[PDB]
Amino acid sequence: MSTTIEKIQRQIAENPILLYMKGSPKLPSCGFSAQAVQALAACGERFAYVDILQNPDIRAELPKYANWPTFPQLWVDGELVGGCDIVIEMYQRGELQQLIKETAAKYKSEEPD
Amino acid sequence: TTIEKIQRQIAENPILLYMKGSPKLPSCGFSAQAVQALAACGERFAYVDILQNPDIRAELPKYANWPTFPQLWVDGELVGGCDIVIEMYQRGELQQLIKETAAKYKSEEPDA
Amino acid sequence: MSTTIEKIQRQIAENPILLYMKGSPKLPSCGFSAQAVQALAACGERFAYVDILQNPDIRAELPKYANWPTFPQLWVDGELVGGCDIVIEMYQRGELQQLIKETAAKYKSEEPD
Amino acid sequence: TTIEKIQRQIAENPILLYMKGSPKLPSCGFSAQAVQALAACGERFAYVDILQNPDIRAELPKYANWPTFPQLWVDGELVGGCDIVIEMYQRGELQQLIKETAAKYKSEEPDA
Ligand SMILES: N[C@H](CCC(=O)N[C@@H](CS)C(=O)NCC(=O)O)C(=O)O
Ligand SMILES: N[C@H](CCC(=O)N[C@@H](CS)C(=O)NCC(=O)O)C(=O)O
Ligand SMILES: N[C@H](CCC(=O)N[C@@H](CS)C(=O)NCC(=O)O)C(=O)O
Ligand SMILES: N[C@H](CCC(=O)N[C@@H](CS)C(=O)NCC(=O)O)C(=O)O
Ligand code: FES
Ligand code: FES
Ligand code: NA
Ligand code: NA
């Protein structure tokens, strides 16, 4: 344990669809992060992001915690899906759309109206 | 205009590194490696963090005819990216170019 | 000029569809090269490759000649198309298929039969 | 079997680097950087070129629970990849671990 592992654990436990990336969804800082965020966002459900370029503690500690050396990282329902290559392949096959749709449905409570 | 800004930058800084993040705080390992080799050459240099200058990030690639960052520019010419810079350092070429550039730019006429 | 630039120029002038990559099409040595070769090959036309991991002179000199720091590189009819990201996007849009089909047609002479 | 081979490797080599290419001739800059930091620590080490061992390339990721190369293994444990190794070197931690490992492995009982 470190306080930063504790922080990451909260983020992952509290956000069922979570993308750690370089930059933000509106202004990505790396093509790998841009590609991943485009495919994720196209699934049409709410997602949370962390810009690891503004969070040096997470940038340093997450790779070892995740057993995954790189960014971006998509975590869905507490599990690491993978990085850019994985996320875009899944989108290409239609599988990302299904995972994300079912995840948002599992955690849906209040509805706009 | 963004191109004019870029043109001046290249014109006014004899050793100039476009990179992601800053030398103390790189945002990409390619930019980290390039700045570390350059810094090792012992001469002052200028950098532009292209993540804080979205216009430059967007326009420099086509201006430079070089698609990526970092980019090292010396005496108004593109030297290359991370892989070029680190090989030059290994071969001792970068040290030479950087020494030569800094000394040529500091050189003055005798006083009188 | 160097003798290696001369060699690269011949390769590009003599091979209308040419992929410089890490490893070979049957045994790629890097996911970027694997992805590019898969998309290219799926276009269904003859292509030539150079494994730059067996050609240190080309690995050293091509990036500066190409104005393109990385591998893989797809060259079509003497022009650099780009690397992995470009080639797969083009395949995704159907544009790679058309470029490659028209290129093979332009250079076709003898036919099997 | 490929896993048994891997298990022995890790068991029999206290400082072990799985990489692309060899230390004199890396096939990837990530592998080049890791070997250069490791070599700088002053101790002998072993490497496996995973581009000449397709079975290891394929199987080690799931065995290691670490998807990529290079991978540095020390005293039977995974230290990490390129980014971990180069940061450890910068902080002086890698030097310590590598010195400690080599000395512990060379240590002998008094003669008698
Ligand atoms: N193959 C990609 C590559 C991702 C990647 O290479 N990320 C690098 C460059 S942005 C990285 O996160 N390095 C660690 C760091 O900069 O902290 C993927 O599937 O996600
Ligand atoms: N092969 C390296 C790597 C540099 C690189 O691949 N940069 C990429 C990723 S940081 C890039 O700038 N892409 C354009 C962009 O992100 O704006 C070199 O020699 O410079
Ligand atoms: N974004 C990719 C990246 C290609 C890439 O990063 N290639 C690197 C790693 S294989 C490279 O060729 N480095 C120069 C070298 O190893 O000689 C593309 O579109 O092609
Ligand atoms: N972020 C680096 C880079 C290492 C890396 O991204 N390796 C990739 C490209 S060489 C890889 O081994 N992919 C699996 C494979 O090619 O077998 C690290 O910390 O180790
Ligand atoms: S910021 Fe340079 S490769 Fe991602
Ligand atoms: S061989 Fe390592 S990124 Fe291509
Ligand atoms: Na981007
Ligand atoms: Na591959």
Domain ranges across chain D: 1-106
For residue D45, which amino acid is it? Answer: F
Q: Which residue has the tokens 């002086």?
A: D92
* SS3 letters across C31-93: HHHHHHHHHHHCCCCCCEEEEHHHCHHHHHHHHHHHCCCCCCEEEECCEEEECHHHHHHHHHH
CATH number, domain D1-106, options 3.40.30.10, 3.30.70.580, 3.90.226.10, 3.10.530.10: 3.40.30.10
In order of C35, C81, C100, D108, the CA distances from C97 in angstroms are 15, 13, 5, 66
Query: Within chain A, what is the greatest distance between any pair of CA atoms?
Result: 43
Structure tokens at D109: 């009982």
CB contact under 8 A, D83 and B29: yes
Determine the straight-line distance between the first and last CA of chain C, rounded to whole angstroms.
43
Residue C108: phi and psi, rounded to 5, are -70, 135
Residue A23 per-residue DSSP state: E
CB < 8 Å to C92, chain A: 92
A38 contacts A5 by C-beta, under 8 angstroms: no
Is residue D13 helix, strand or coil?
coil
Q: What angle do CA D32, D34, D35 make, to 5 degrees?
A: 70
C21 contacts C52 by C-beta, under 8 angstroms: yes
Other CB atoms within 10 Å distance of the CB of residue B17: 24
Interface test with B, best of A29, A30, A52, A70 (most B CBs within 10 A): A29
CA–CA distance, D83 with D34 (Å, rounded to integer): 8
Candidate of A20, A21, A24, A30 to mutate for ligand 5, largest count of ligand atoms within 8 Å of Cβ: A30
A-B contacts at Cβ under 8 angstroms: 12
- Give me the residue from D29, D82, D83 closest to B83, CB to CB: D29
With a Cβ cut-off of 6 Å, ligand 1 is lined by A 22, 30, 32, 59, 70-72, 83-85; B 28-29; D 83
CA–CA distance, A17 with D7 (Å, rounded to integer): 36
To the nearest 10 degrees (0 to 180), the angle between helices D82-91 and D93-106 is: 90
C30 in ligand 4 pocket by Cβ < 6 Å? yes
CA–CA distance, B109 with B99 (Å, rounded to integer): 19
Interface of chain A against chain D, CB under 8 Å?
A: 60, 63-64, 67-70
- Classify each residue of D10-43 as buried b or exposed e, where b means 16 or more C-beta atoms within 10 Å of its C-beta: beebbbbbbbbbebeebbbbbbbbbbbbbeebeb
Q: How far is C29 from chain D (nearest CA, A)?
A: 7
Write down the CATH number for the domain with range A1-108: 3.40.30.10
CA–CA distance, D30 with D24 (Å, rounded to integer): 14
Residue B85 per-residue DSSP state: H
CB < 8 Å to D54, chain C: 27
B72, β-bridge pairs: B17, B80
All residues at 6 or more sequence positions from A105 whose CB lies less than 8 Å from its CB, including other chains: none
A21, with CB counted inside 10 A (0-12, 13-18, 19+), is buried
Sign of CA dihedral B58, B60, B64, B67: negative
Q: Which of C82, C83, C100, C80 is nearest to C30 (CA)?
A: C83
Binding residue ranges of C for glutathione: 22, 59, 71, 84-85
A-C contacts at Cβ under 8 angstroms: 5
CA–CA distance, B79 with B64 (Å, rounded to integer): 10
